[PDB]
Amino acid sequence: EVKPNPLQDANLCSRVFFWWLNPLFKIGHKRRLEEDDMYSVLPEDRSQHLGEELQGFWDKEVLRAENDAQKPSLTRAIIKCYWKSYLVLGIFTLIEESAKVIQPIFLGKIINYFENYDPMDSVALNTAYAYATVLTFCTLILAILHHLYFYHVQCAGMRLRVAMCHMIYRKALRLSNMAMGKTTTGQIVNLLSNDVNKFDQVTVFLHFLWAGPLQAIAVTALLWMEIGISCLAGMAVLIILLPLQSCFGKLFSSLRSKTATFTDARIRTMNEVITGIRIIKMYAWEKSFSNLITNLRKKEISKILRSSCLRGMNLASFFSASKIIVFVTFTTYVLLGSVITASRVFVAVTLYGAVRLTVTLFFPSAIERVSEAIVSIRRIQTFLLLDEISQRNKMVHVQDFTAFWDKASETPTLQGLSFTVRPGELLAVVGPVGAGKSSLLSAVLGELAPSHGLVSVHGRIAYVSQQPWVFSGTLRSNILFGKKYEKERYEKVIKACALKKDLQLLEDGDLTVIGDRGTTLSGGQKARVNLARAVYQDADIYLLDDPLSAVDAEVSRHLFELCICQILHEKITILVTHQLQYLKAASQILILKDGKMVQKGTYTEFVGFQAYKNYFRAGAHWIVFIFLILLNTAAQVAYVLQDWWLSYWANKQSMLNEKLDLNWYLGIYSGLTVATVLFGIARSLLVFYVLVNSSQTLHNKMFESILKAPVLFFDRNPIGRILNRFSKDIGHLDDLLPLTFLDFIQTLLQVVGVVSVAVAVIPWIAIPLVPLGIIFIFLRRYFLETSRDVKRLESTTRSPVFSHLSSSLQGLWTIRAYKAEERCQELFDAHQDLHSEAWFLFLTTSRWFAVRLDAICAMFVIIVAFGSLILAKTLDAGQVGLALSYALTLMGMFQWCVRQSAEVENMMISVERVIEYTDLEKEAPWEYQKRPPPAWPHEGVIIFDNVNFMYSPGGPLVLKHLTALIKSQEKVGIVGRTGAGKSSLISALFRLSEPEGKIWIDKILTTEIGLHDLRKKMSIIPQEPVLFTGTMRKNLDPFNEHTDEELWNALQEVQLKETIEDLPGKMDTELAESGSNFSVGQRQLVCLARAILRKNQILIIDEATANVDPRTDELIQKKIREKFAHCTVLTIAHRLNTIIDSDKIMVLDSGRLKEYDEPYVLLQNKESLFYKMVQQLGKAEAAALTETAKQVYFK
Ligand SMILES: CC(C)CCC[C@@H](C)[C@H]1CC[C@H]2[C@@H]3CC=C4C[C@@H](OC(=O)CCC(=O)O)CC[C@]4(C)[C@H]3CC[C@]12C
Ligand SMILES: CC(C)CCC[C@@H](C)[C@H]1CC[C@H]2[C@@H]3CC=C4C[C@@H](OC(=O)CCC(=O)O)CC[C@]4(C)[C@H]3CC[C@]12C
Ligand SMILES: CC(C)CCC[C@@H](C)[C@H]1CC[C@H]2[C@@H]3CC=C4C[C@@H](OC(=O)CCC(=O)O)CC[C@]4(C)[C@H]3CC[C@]12C
Ligand SMILES: CC(C)CCC[C@@H](C)[C@H]1CC[C@H]2[C@@H]3CC=C4C[C@@H](OC(=O)CCC(=O)O)CC[C@]4(C)[C@H]3CC[C@]12C
Ligand SMILES: CC(C)CCC[C@@H](C)[C@H]1CC[C@H]2[C@@H]3CC=C4C[C@@H](O)CC[C@]4(C)[C@H]3CC[C@]12C
Ligand SMILES: CC(C)CCC[C@@H](C)[C@H]1CC[C@H]2[C@@H]3CC=C4C[C@@H](O)CC[C@]4(C)[C@H]3CC[C@]12C
């Protein structure tokens, strides 16, 4: 075996305790686990086996259904396959759910030992140990045997998930090209990614659909025997708790849905502000986007906070419902005139405890998961019933062939087509873009069926598609593509077809792994790989669609002459080509246009304590956390005292011969119930408020740091990386961490309550509770080191299986051409059961911890049950009833506590990422105490005095010693090769990084004044304009400093007025994302309007119109000269015609101011590097440039 699996050889006890898995933890404690450490899946769990199995039942179901004249039901097929195995796990559900019910009955019988206690009855003591021992076996069933069962019901979901994944991939290969229109590739991946994933969860609780209500009937029958008619008072609260949970849960969903719209609006604006952060800074618009996020955040956080009250009250109801259920029972019980006894009390408390979880959690969750599983099942059935290609389909022959991609009143896509080619004949296909193009080849493949006329083909086909598709796998396999390896032929297609030219190097040999997994090849390599695949498949019919666009022309001749011609001289070849050498080499040419055959013939016709402290001490003062701790402990103290009082009341009743003052005992009992409920909600709401206020503050600080972060930070960090902290990390802080943190500390205090009643009742239990505490701490670490690794392995192995369907579904015509559907299926199965073994580790690692984590819980129950009974003369029925009623509760709480403490830790990593972006470095303050006057650029003189510029501290000097004077209103051109420093001069002038040296503007040193004092008072037209979402008004003036008349006038000057007046909102017309409603040229017209509106005396133009069509270029250039004649203008240009008439040109080379003079005085020096750059144009317009400069300076 490749990776032996110990579960095949495991003894019954070995797999009950998951003892077979211990060596994995030995390894993962020492090393990081890798995919080679995973155990291979069991043979019955292979994706091939599971998917092939379910196809049999689904095939029969489709056959059965049509014989019955009915719709197929995939739910019937799924049941037919799995029902016989999954009902056998129902036997243990009956055994386990009756152990939940029989614990309370034997609890009562051990308590009856204390109620009737006399120390001399040795027979009674022995009988009490029998009840304690049966209570232990019931406890061990719930603790030890539950987990082997729970592993099996989880495998039943994996087997359904893996079988369905195989089925839908097998179908995905078979989809008709019409069905590939009705469905997006992203939707079919969504089946694998989201819908089939529902089947893991459905089988966890599917047995509670029957075991849930059946247990309620059993518990109510026993409560009637225990408590009589008064049991309906508690069961009413249990049952009525179901509609309230569901109804208020639906209300929570409405707020959840209304929150997301503000979240997405915020994140979209975040995407815009981060991507545009460099131009936003140069405009000094951070205050605009600051308000916009602040408003979107206040709306979002209000509904987050309001939604958190429902989740706070949901947890508060789950906490305190146990108190109300037993209150209304025992209030009714005693008012009806039955006295409180300790045995009948704590049997009832335990019976309500047993059934509350099934009624209020497992049964409604079973319904919810089965509801949305059936959604997925029918959703996938719609896909499984999509249309398919005719399932079974040397010459290829075509006459009158007429076909449609879809039937329409339009022209056919291909019509009248008539050609026929014999062994060795080659046809070139020629036409404009969209003329018919690849569709003729698609017709030979049979991807278009004949609607009229006929085609036929005999022998095998090879197909080098226009898109160079390659599957994720070894290059060797990409060439073999499901045909067997042969040394001679494979070496022939790599030696004689000299792939070695670009494969002996930069590829690590031919065993390199191609595709989405990595090593991603350029398109030219894939085309040769696809052609080499075609040569290796060595087909009789041979279709080339576009090898030649991908490879270079030098490779093209080698590729065509030495292989396509010499090897395929007898093979029936069709070649779509634009390289005329191959057109002439063809035996015939087919010319087509818009699906019409124009001409046919031969060419001869022509996380430590610091993170928790900084998370907590960010939304509440430490005085609140003192009061918050008091609410938490008071909630749990009152929770336990509500049960202690009932044992005290039972003890006080026990000594009467007279009656108890029922007003007083029932009155305090009602006060304790009110206390635990009111402290329950108060605790839960204050936690949620403090932690949601913590995310409010951490966001405000994080966002504030991002706007004031220097541009260097945005260059080092990708746009997606910064966005993820605003999308995902703060997402956790807003709506999942405060829930998990409350649920943790809510349950944590429940565990402390359970173990402190036991120590308070039996103080000796604290001695065997220190070994258990130490064991659990080591166990948790010893687990977590391996658990985090298999969690990482599992998450990493998913993306291959989704990626394989995505790329395979993109390559359907290639896959079907070679008939490699079996080979591509096996590749999916290999990826599907690489994950299935990572998921197998996920299931069994979790259950290895849980069985041990429940072993210490069951050990605690045994110590209490037997220590209460060894020390029986010390205790009394109320104390023993209390301590045992609680010990039995530990099982489900302590495992959940530990399963909500790693989620807290795994989410606090997002908090430290949010805190990381809170302490970013800041650029200089936007406004220093020294400020310019309201009229500061009075002359617009700019002086660079020995200016040095670096983009990074300690980076290479990009500007060197640059020293230049720019006179008032002077127009300065900046020219240079790429990297000469043109754009770096702007970054120095706007102080996007701090320049070394001094930049003076109007005698004011630009490094003394604030960044908004400097950046507002200079206008820039960038090369790549950004239009933000929102109104045209907000894109022209987000501060409303200008009147609508001024805005319309500026829009008229840039000729946008008519276009914008035609918009249905005029100035309040909402622009689409990035201004996609406008062309790139139009976007710069908006920027020119921005510059015109600001009326700054300094305008900087950075290669702006080089992205722009000549007519709009002429418009922008004309308007700049007209409107900014009185301004100092710095124009960086690539087209010298646009600046040849400047007053001066700064010439940059390699970051140095090589020349700075009047353009003609430059060109009058024939040795100037301006003159060289002009002569490098190679065009007579260089003379016109020289004359154009000369004619300026006489004036
Ligand atoms: C004493 C014991 C044996 C009683 C057994 C209980 C059954 C009589 C009932 C109780 C809960 C019912 C289930 C409750 C909810 C659902 C989900 C529901 O599915 C949906 O509503 C979503 C799919 C759709 O209907 O479109 C209908 C089936 C099912 C499994 C019901 C099937 C029949 C169940 C198991
Ligand atoms: C931090 C805030 C929420 C205060 C929490 C304090 C509690 C931990 C303390 C305060 C008063 C204590 C109680 C004071 C009095 C009693 C009565 C006492 O009952 C008797 O002594 C008579 C019956 C018997 O013989 O035990 C049992 C302990 C108990 C409940 C104590 C349990 C612990 C309590 C609730
Ligand atoms: C609400 C929480 C956070 C505060 C913790 C203490 C309380 C829950 C109080 C409420 C009722 C109190 C009990 C009420 C009555 C008694 C009986 C009392 O014994 C008597 O016989 C009193 C006779 C009398 O003086 O009238 C001893 C204290 C005790 C257990 C009190 C202990 C403290 C209790 C449980
Ligand atoms: C005397 C015992 C029973 C303890 C009392 C505890 C109080 C101090 C707790 C109980 C409920 C808590 C409140 C629960 C709800 C809110 C509303 C919350 O405001 C909103 O959620 C508004 C949302 C919106 O604007 O839509 C701010 C915290 C606050 C006042 C909490 C502050 C602390 C309160 C008042
Ligand atoms: C398998 C199901 C029922 C859950 C597990 C409960 C099993 C372990 C329980 C259910 C009923 C129990 C029996 C009920 C009563 C008695 C009498 C007493 O002197 C103890 C032993 C004996 C004979 C019990 C043995 C254990 C027992 C069979
Ligand atoms: C909430 C956390 C932080 C601390 C645990 C507080 C609660 C659970 C603890 C604190 C003091 C404990 C009480 C101390 C003494 C007694 C008397 C005993 O004869 C029965 C139990 C009883 C009544 C205990 C019940 C549990 C108790 C109230």
UniProtKB/Swiss-Prot annotation:
TM segment ranges: 87-107, 130-150, 201-221, 222-242, 322-342, 345-365, 426-446, 621-641, 672-692, 737-757, 759-779, 855-875, 878-898, 939-959
> Where is it expressed, tissue-wise?
Widely expressed, with particularly high levels in prostate, but is barely detectable in liver. sinusoidal membrane of hepatocytes.
Domain ABC transporter span(s) in chain numbering: 396-606, 942-1175
- Listed binding positions for ATP 1 are G431, P432, V433, G434, A435, G436, K437, S438
Known activity regulation?
GSH stimulates the transport of MRP4. Urate inhibits methotrexate transport but stimulates cGMP transport. Nonsteroidal anti-inflammatory drugs (NSAIDs) strongly suppress the transport of MRP4 substrates.
Alphabetically sorted, this entry's keywords are: ATP-binding, Cell membrane, Glycoprotein, Lipid transport, Membrane, Nucleotide-binding, Phosphoprotein, Repeat, Translocase, Transmembrane, Transmembrane helix, Transport
**According to its UniProt record, where is this protein located?**
Basolateral cell membrane; Apical cell membrane
Positions contributing to ATP 2 binding: G976, R977, T978, G979, A980, G981, K982, S983
Q: Which cofactor does it need?
A: Mg(2+)
Upon changing V755F, the result is:
Transport properties comparable to wild-type
Task: Select a single GO molecular function from the record's annotations and give it.
Answer: efflux transmembrane transporter activity
E.C. no = 7.6.2.-, 7.6.2.2, 7.6.2.3
Q: Which residues are glycosylated?
A: N657
Q: Which CDD domains match?
A: ABC_6TM_MRP4_D1_like, ABC_6TM_MRP4_D2_like, ABCC_MRP_domain1, ABCC_MRP_domain2
Enzyme class, broadest EC rank: translocase
Q: Reported effect of changing N657Q?
A: Does not affect plasma membrane localization; 1.5 fold increase in PEG2 transport; does not affect estradiol 17-beta-D-glucuronide transport
What is catalyzed by this enzyme?
A: ATP + H2O + xenobioticSide 1 = ADP + phosphate + xenobioticSide 2; an S-substituted glutathione(in) + ATP + H2O = an S-substituted glutathione(out) + ADP + phosphate + H(+); 17beta-estradiol 17-O-(beta-D-glucuronate)(in) + ATP + H2O = 17beta-estradiol 17-O-(beta-D-glucuronate)(out) + ADP + phosphate + H(+); dehydroepiandrosterone 3-sulfate(in) + ATP + H2O = dehydroepiandrosterone 3-sulfate(out) + ADP + phosphate + H(+)
The keyword Zinc-finger is annotated on this UniProt entry: no
The family classification in the record reads:
Belongs to the ABC transporter superfamily. ABCC family. Conjugate transporter (TC 3.A.1.208) subfamily.
| Subunit-structure text | Interacts (via PDZ-binding motif) with SNX27 (via PDZ domain); this interaction accelerates MRP4 internalization.
Function of the protein: ATP-dependent transporter of the ATP-binding cassette (ABC) family that actively extrudes physiological compounds and xenobiotics from cells. Transports a range of endogenous molecules that have a key role in cellular communication and signaling, including cyclic nucleotides such as cyclic AMP (cAMP) and cyclic GMP (cGMP), bile acids, steroid conjugates, urate, and prostaglandins. Mediates the ATP-dependent efflux of glutathione conjugates such as leukotriene C4 (LTC4) and leukotriene B4 (LTB4) too.
Q: What is this protein called?
A: ATP-binding cassette sub-family C member 4
